Design a protein around this ligand. Sequence first.
Ligand SMILES: [Mg+2]
Ligand SMILES: [Mg+2]
Ligand SMILES: [Mg+2]
Ligand SMILES: [Mg+2]
Ligand SMILES: [Mg+2]
Ligand SMILES: [Mg+2]
Lengths: 125, 222, 196, 196, 204, 211, 233, 226, 195, 195
Amino acid sequence: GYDRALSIFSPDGHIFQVEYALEAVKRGTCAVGVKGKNCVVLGCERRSTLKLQDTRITPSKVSKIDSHVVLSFSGLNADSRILIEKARVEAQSHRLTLEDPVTVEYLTRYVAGVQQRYTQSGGVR
Amino acid sequence: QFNPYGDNGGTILGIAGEDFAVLAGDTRNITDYSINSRYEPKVFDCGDNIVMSANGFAADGDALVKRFKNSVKWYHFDHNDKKLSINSAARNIQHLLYSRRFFPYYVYNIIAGLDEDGKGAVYSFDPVGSYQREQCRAGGAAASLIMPFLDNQVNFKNQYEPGTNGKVKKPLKYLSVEEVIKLVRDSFTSATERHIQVGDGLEILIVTKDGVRKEFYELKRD
Amino acid sequence: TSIMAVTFKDGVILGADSRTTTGAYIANRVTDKLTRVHDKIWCCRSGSAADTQAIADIVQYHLELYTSQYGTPSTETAASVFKELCYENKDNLTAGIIVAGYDDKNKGEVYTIPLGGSVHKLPYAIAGSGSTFIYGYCDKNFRENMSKEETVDFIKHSLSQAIKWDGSSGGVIRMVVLTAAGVERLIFYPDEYEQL
Amino acid sequence: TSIMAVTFKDGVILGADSRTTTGAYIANRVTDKLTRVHDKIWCCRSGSAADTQAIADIVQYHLELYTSQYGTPSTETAASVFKELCYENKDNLTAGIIVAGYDDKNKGEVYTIPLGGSVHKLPYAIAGSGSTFIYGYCDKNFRENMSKEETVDFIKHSLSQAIKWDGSSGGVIRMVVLTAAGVERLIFYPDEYEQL
Amino acid sequence: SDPSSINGGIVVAMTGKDCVAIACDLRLGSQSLGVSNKFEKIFHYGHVFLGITGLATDVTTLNEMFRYKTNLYKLKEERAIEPETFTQLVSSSLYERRFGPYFVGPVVAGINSKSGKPFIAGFDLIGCIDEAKDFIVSGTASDQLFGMCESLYEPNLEPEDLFETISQALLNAADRDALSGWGAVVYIIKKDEVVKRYLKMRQD
Amino acid sequence: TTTLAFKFQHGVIAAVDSRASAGSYISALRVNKVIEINPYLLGTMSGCAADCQYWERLLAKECRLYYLRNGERISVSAASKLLSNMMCQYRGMGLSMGSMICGWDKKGPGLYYVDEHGTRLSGNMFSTGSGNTYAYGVLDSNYKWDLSVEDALYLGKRSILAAAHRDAYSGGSVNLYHVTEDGWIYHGNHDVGELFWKVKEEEGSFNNVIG
Amino acid sequence: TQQPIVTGTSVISMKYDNGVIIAADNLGSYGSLLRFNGVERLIPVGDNTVVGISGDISDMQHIERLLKDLVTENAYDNPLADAEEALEPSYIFEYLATVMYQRRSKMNPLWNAIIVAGVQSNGDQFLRYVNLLGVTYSSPTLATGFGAHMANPLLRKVVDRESDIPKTTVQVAEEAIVNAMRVLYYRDARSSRNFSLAIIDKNTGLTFKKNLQVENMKWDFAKDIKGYGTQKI
Amino acid sequence: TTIVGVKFNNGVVIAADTRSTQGPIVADKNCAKLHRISPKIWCAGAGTAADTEAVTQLIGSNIELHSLYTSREPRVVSALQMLKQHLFKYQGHIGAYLIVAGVDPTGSHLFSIHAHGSTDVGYYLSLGSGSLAAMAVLESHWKQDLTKEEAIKLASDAIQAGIWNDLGSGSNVDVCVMEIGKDAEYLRNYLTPNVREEKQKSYKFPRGTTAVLKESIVNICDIQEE
Amino acid sequence: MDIILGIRVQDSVILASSKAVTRGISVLKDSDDKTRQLSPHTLMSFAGEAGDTVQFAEYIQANIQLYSIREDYELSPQAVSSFVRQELAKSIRSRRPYQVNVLIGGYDKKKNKPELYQIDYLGTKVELPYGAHGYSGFYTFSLLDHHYRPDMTTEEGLDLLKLCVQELEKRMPMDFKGVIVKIVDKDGIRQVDDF
Amino acid sequence: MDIILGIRVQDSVILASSKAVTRGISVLKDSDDKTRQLSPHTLMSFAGEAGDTVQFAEYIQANIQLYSIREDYELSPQAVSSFVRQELAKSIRSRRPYQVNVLIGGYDKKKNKPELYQIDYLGTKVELPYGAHGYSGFYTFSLLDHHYRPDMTTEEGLDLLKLCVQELEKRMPMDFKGVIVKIVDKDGIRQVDDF
Ligand SMILES: [Mg+2]
Ligand SMILES: [Mg+2]
Ligand SMILES: [Mg+2]
Ligand SMILES: [Mg+2]
Ligand SMILES: [Mg+2]
Ligand SMILES: [Mg+2]
C-alpha cells in the first residue's frame, strides 16, 4: 500500500500540509455559528459566481448528523462529505452500543479525531 | 444387517367400467438398475371372476396372491361352492394383510371384477390392509405419472364445456372397453418414456360376465 | 494362532504354535492347541478359546457315546459333529477348527471347518491368523504321500515362518502324529525352528 | 495389488501384477504399476491409484528439476522426496510405494515407504494386498547377489502365488530390470506363470 | 427439511408452432401451511422468460440476480439478451455455487428475436442444461407433469391450442400435488406479443 | 387429514375431509374417513387408515354381539371403552389411531375421542388431523348448543373447508353425517373445489383469494 | 441375521431349443482370499434337474443335503419313484423357494442366490431363480451376482425373447455360456479359471461336465500398454 | 449412462447413449454426452452431468489458450494432465468420470479418468452404470488392428448392450470418430432404435376447455418514444 | 418470543406481539415489547431464537435511521422490506445465521396505502393482508380467512384481532401473557394501551 | 395432565389438579378431572404419560372396590397407599412400566386424621403435609414452606392453594387451564365448584 509520509515537520517545527489545508479553508465560503439563550443558529455564505444553480438538489452547506446535531463547514466540499458520513455512522453506532444519542461534544471529539488521524497517517493528506 | 424387503419395480393399473373391469400391469421385473425378467406375469386370475395384482416386493406379492387363491378354494369347501363376491374378497384380503401389521406384505394390491349387480368394480389396498372401492387406480412405481392423466381423461377433471368458461363441467359419460384399453396403453407408453422401471411388455386382464380375457402389448425395452 | 494338519503316506500330522494373546499381552506362551476328541481323531483350534474348548468337549462327549453304541467313529463322522455345532450356532461362535484323524480303512484324513460352519476335505489345511503368511510357501512345498520325516520338516518350516511374521503366533511348535503305530507327540523349541 | 522390488548382482528388478479393482469389479486388467520417476529410478505403486499417480508425478517433476541443476539424483534422494510427500500429507493419502533404482556407485537399491511415510532400505521389498500371502515364500527363497535369471524366477514365482491367493491381484506380471546395461521391460502371461 | 420441497410449486414450459408457453402455480407455503396464493414464479428480462421453482428465498434472489445481470448486459451490448445466451448465463451462475447451491429448478422460455426460433430449457440446481424440443417440467409435481406432458403433448400446436394443452398439464398435475396449486398463470409467447392468463382452479 | 364432530341440541354432527397423501403426492382424492360401525354408531378416522378400519370394524362385531347377548343396544360410553381397551393391548407396538365415536343412546347424544394411547375423552366438540387447528377456529367462534340441524351441518361443513384451504394435506371433498336417536343420516359428498367458490360468493369470505 | 463367510460367485444359465444349460465356477472365496479351488456349486437332482447355487457355501452345503433328503423321501412308499412320480424341476424349485421365503420371514435367511435348471416330464424347459429374500423370477437367460451384469447382456444377444429359444441350438448356447465364463474371469475379481457346466436336454438327458477351463484368452495387447498417461517407456 | 472408447488402425472412436436421469425419472431422452475439448480431442462423461460439462469446458478453454500461446495444436496428454490435476485437487467432489480420446501431432490416444484423479490407458474402455454390459461386449469382440468401420460397429454395439440391459442407459447412440490426418466427425444420433410408437388417441383439447379468470398483454418492449 | 400477528386494514397496519419471555422453565417477563420503529411510518415486529431477534432488529433500525439522515428522506415500506429480506437471505448462508422471523407494518405516504410484509429467517418475503409466524397462523388464519375485508376500519381490525387472540388463548398449550398491539397509519405509530 | 397439588390441613385433605389435556399442539380439553374415588373417604389424583394415568387409576379403583365388597370394610388410607406403591414398584421393572405419578388424599375414620401420600411412578412413597409432582413443587413449595400450619382450617388451606395456583399461573410457561379442587374429610369427598 501507499505509505508515503506527506504530513511531516519542517525545520521551524511546522507541518506545512496541515497549514496548507488551512489555506483551503480560507478559500472556502464563509460559515458562521451563533448560540442564543435557547437556540443555535448556523449561517452560511453562498458565492453568487454560480447562478443557473438548482438550489433544490445542490448539496446544502448545513448537514444533519443526527436529529439533534448539525454540521456546517468551510473548505473543500468533497472532503467534508467524508467527515459527514463518518460522523453519521458514528452517531448511529453510539445509539446502538450505548443506547443514548451522542452529545455534541462527543460528536465533535470524534470528527476532530478523524481529522487529526489524517495528519499523522501514511499515504494520506 | 439383513434387509428382508426389496423393490422389484413394476406398475399396475385398474379401471372399472360400467359392465366390465380391467387390471393391467407391465411385465418387467427389476432390482436396482438390472432387469431380472422382461416377462414375469404380475396380474393373476384368482377364480370366481376375480383378478388380482400385488405390486411392490415380489416375494410378498407372490405370497399374498398365493394365500388369497387359497382362501377362495377354502371358501368353496366351507360354504357349499358359493361364489366369492368381489366385496367379500376385498374384506378377506384386508384380514390377510392386517395379520402382518407388524411385519407387513410390502405390496400395493388391486383386485378387479364385477359386483353383485353386474357392474364393474376395482378395489385398492395399502400394505397394511386399508381398502376401498374405486373407479380408477394406478399403483406402483409410475403411479404418480399415470393417475393425474386418468383424473383428466377418465373423470374429466379440470375440463369444462367450451363457451361457458368454467361454469359448466364436462359431463361424465361412460367409457367403453375399447376406450379404456386405449387410455391404458397410452398411460403405460407414457410411463415407459419417463420411468426406467417401466417397460418391456404390458399385460391386461379384462373381466366381464362372460369371463376373464387377456391382452398383451409390447413396450420399449430400454 | 498358527495351525495346520497334513496328510502323508502313513497317516496324518497336526501342528500348532503355543501362543494365546489378550490384545498384545501373551496370556499363555505354552498353550496346547492340539486337542483329542477320540483315540486317533484330533483337532486344531483357532478363534475364541472358550468357544473351541466348549465345542471340542461336546464333540468328545458325542464320539464317546457313539463308540459305546456303534464302535469306533470315522474321521468324517467327527468332522460332521463339529460342523453341526459350528453351523447351527454360527451366530454365537467364533471358531476355526481343523479336524484330523486316522482310520485303517481310510488312512489319514483332514477336514477344515472355517467360520461359517462349512466343511472342506483337503490333503492339508492351514488356519489361524499366521496362516495368511504361509499360503505361498505351503502351496509350493506340499507334496502328497510324503514320509513322516518330510512331513514333520514341512510343518516345522511352515509354522516357523508363520511364527516369524505373525505377532499373535509364537512359543513352541507342537505336533501330533496319527498312524497305525499309535499316537506320537512332538515338540520343537525356538532355538531349533528360528534358525531354519 | 502385488508388487515387489529385488536387488541382485547386476542391479535391481521391480515386479508387479496388472489388476486394478473397484470392489469386486476389475476396472483394469492390464494396469502398469511400474512407474518411471527418472531414467534409472522407478517405483511400484499400491494404495489409492489417484494418490500414487499424483505423488509419482510430483516426484518426477522434482527429480527433473534436480537433474537440471545438480545432475543425476541418487535413489536415496528419490526415496526422500517420496517420503517427504507421504509423511507430510499422511492424513490425506493412502499410498504404499516401493522405490527402486540403479546407480553406478551404489548399484541396485530398494526403499519401501509404507502407509505412515516411514522409509526402510531393504535388500528386497514386497507390498500390496497380495504380499501377505508370500511373506513366508519370499523369506525362504530370497538370496543376496542372485543372477538376473534367478531374480526374474524369484519374482515370477512369488507374484504367481500372490496372484493365486489374492483376488485383488491378477492379470499379467510386469517387470522392469535396472542395470548398467540400461532399462529392460519384461512381461509374463497367465498361461506361463499359473503352471509354476 | 428438504429445501426443494419446503415451499412447493411447479413450472412447465412447452414449444409450439412459432410460439412458446410457460406456466406456473401460485402457491407458496411452509410445508403443510399455505402462505400465499399470489407467489408468481415466472419472470421476464426483455423477451426472455424465466420460471423458477424450489426454495422461495432463492427464487426471489435469483430473479434479482438475473435482472441485475441482464440490465448490465443490455447497457454494454446495446441489445436485449437472447434465450440461448441467457440459458448459458443461468448455467454459469448456478455452477459458480457448485458446493453451496441455490435450491432451485429454473426453466427458460423464449423466442430468438433474429431467427424467430422457439426455445425452452431446464436446469438442475447446479446448472446442467436440458434443452428439450418438446417440454420442460420443474417443481414438486414434476413426476405428475412428466406424465401429463408426455401424453398430452404433440408438436407444432398453434398458440391457442398450446394454451389448452399446457393449462391442462399444469392443472391436473397440481391437483395430484399437496404442495402445488392455489392458482395458476400461463404465458403464451409469440415473436412480438405475449398474453398472460390466470386460470381458475380448486383452492385446496 | 381433517375430522371433526360435535354435540348439539338435535344430536351430533360428524364432518371429515377426503384426502390421502404419500409425501407430497396425493394418493387418494376420495377416501371414506367415517366408519359406519352400525346404524347408531359412527367412527371418524385419523392416523393409520388400516388401524382405524380394522379395529373399528372389530368394534362393530363386539357391539353386535353385545346386543345379541343383552337384548339391548350398547351405549356410546361402553362402545368407546371397548375400543380404547383394544388399543391398550397393543400399547407401545406402533398403532396410530385418532377417532371420535359418535352416537345416540339413553343418556342422549354421545361423543368420545379415542386414540392409540388408550385415551378416552368425553366432550362436546373434537377435531383431529393435520388441519384440526383451522377447523377449531371456525367451530369455537360459531358453535352454540342452540344450533338448528341445518346450521349445524353447515358449520361442520364450513369448518372442514377452512382446513382444506389452508392445510396442504387436507382437501378433496367433505362428507357429512347427522346422528339422531333413530340412527345416523348421511348428508352427502361435497367437492371442496366447487364448495369453496360457492361459499366464497354466498358468504363473502376468502376475500384474499381471487375468483 | 448373519453375514456370508465362504462365498461362491456368479451362476449363469440359459434356455435353448431342446433344453437348458447352466454353469458356475469352482471357487469358494473367503473375502478377497481365493481359499478353496475345488468347490462344486452345480448340484444335480436325479437325471432331469441341476441346481446352481451362489452365495454362502455353508448354506449351500445345507441346501445340498435338503435336496439329497428330498430324493430319499420321494422314494418312500413310491413304486413310481424312477418314473411318473419322480421329482420334477418345478417340484424341486417350489420346495426351495418355500424354504428361502420362510427363512427370510424368520429373519434368518439362507444367504444364497439359486437357479434351478431342468427339463419337465412333458419336455418343457425349466429355468427359474430364487434368492435369500424369497424373490423368484424366470427368463430365457438367468444369472446371479456379476453374471447378471456381464453375462446376461451377452446371453440375451443370443436369446433376446421367448421366440428365439427354438432357433438356438445346444452348440450355440454352450458357446455363449463358455464365452460368458471367460468374460467373467477377465472382469470378476472373485472368479476362477476352473468351472463346471451342465446340460439338461430332453433327448440326450443330463450331461455334466467337470474340470473345464477358460481358454483362448487375449492378453498380448498388454505389452504395449505403458504408464498411466505420459510415460513412454 | 453408458460410454465407451475404442482404438483402431488410424485413430480412435468414442460413443455414448443419450439418457439423463434424476433417480428413476428420465429428465432428457436425447442428452448429449459427447463433449468437445478441442477440435480433435473429444470426451464422454458419466457421473454428475453438470460436473462433466463444467470441467470439460474449463479444460477446453485453457487448452485453447494454450494452443494459441504455443502456436501448436493441442495434445490429448495435455487435456488428460489438466483434467486429472483439477479433479484430484477437489478430492472426488467433482463427480466427473470421463473417457478422453483424440488425435494430435503425436498420434491417436485413448484414456479414462476417474473423479478422484486417477487415469488409465487402454485400447478399449467403458464407463457409467452400463459399463459392465458394454465391457462384456468389448471383451467378447475386440481385437487388435481394427478398421474404422469395425471400431464404430463395436463401439455402438457396446452402447446398445447398455441401452437394452442397463436401466440407467437408453434412447440413442452418439458417436465421434477421430482419425489421424482428418477432421473429427461427430455423428449425433448415429443410431435411433427407440422411437416412440404412435399413440392410440389424440389429446388435443377443444378451445375454451380451460377456465380463465383474467387476460392481459405483457409489455416486453422497452419504454417507447413520444 | 413466539407469537406475532399482523393485519392490514383500510388505512392502517396493526401488529400484535406476545409479551412473554421464558428462560428455562420460568417466565422472566410478561411485558416485553417485541418490536422496533425503523422509521416514523414503518414498524417491525420479530420472533425467533433468543438474542438474535433484538440484535437483528436493532441492526436493521440503525441502518434505516442512517439512510434517513443521509438522504433526509423516509424509505418506502417496500424498500425497507427488500433491504431486510436481503439481509436475511445473506444471513441464512452465513457461518451462524440469524434465526429471526419478522413482520413489517408500514404506511406508504407516497401511495397513501398501508402495507404488511411477512419475512421469515430464510429471507422468504410475501406481502399480505394479514400474516403470522410459527404456529400462530394455524390457530388464527381460519378466522382471518372468514372475517377479513380490505375495507375494514381500524376498530374492526382490532375486534377481529381480539377474536384471534381469544382463539390462541383457548387452543394453544403455551401461555404467552397476552399481546401488545400497535397501529401504523398516516400519522405514524401508536400503541393501544388497553387490550 | 401435568399439574397435581395436595395439602393436608387440620381435618381434611385438599387435592388440586389441572384441567388441560393436550394432543400435539392443540389443547383438546379444559375440564378434565384427573382423579378417581378409590373408596368413600379416599381420593387419588394422578399425572404422567397419556393413557397410562387413567388405566392405572381405574385398575387401582377396581381393586379397592373389590376389597371393600369382599370384607364389607373400607381400607385405611395407609393400606391403600401401600397397595398402590407396591403396584408401581412392581410396574417399574415390568416390560413396559406405567408412567404414572399419584397423590392419595384420604381421611382415616379410625384415627380421625386426614392423610396425604405422594407416590411417583418408581414406587417412591412419602407421607406429607403438602405435596406435588413434576415441576409443580418448584413454584409452589416456597409458598407452602412459608405459610403452612398443621392447624389450618379447610378455608385457609384453600386460600393458600389459590396463592400457589396464582404463582403457577404467573411463572409457568404452560397454560394448564386452572384446577379442579376436591376436599376429603370425615363426611367423604366433595368438589369445590367455584375456584
Ligand atoms: Mg423405461
Ligand atoms: Mg487372482
Ligand atoms: Mg394441491
Ligand atoms: Mg389443502
Ligand atoms: Mg484422496
Ligand atoms: Mg414468510
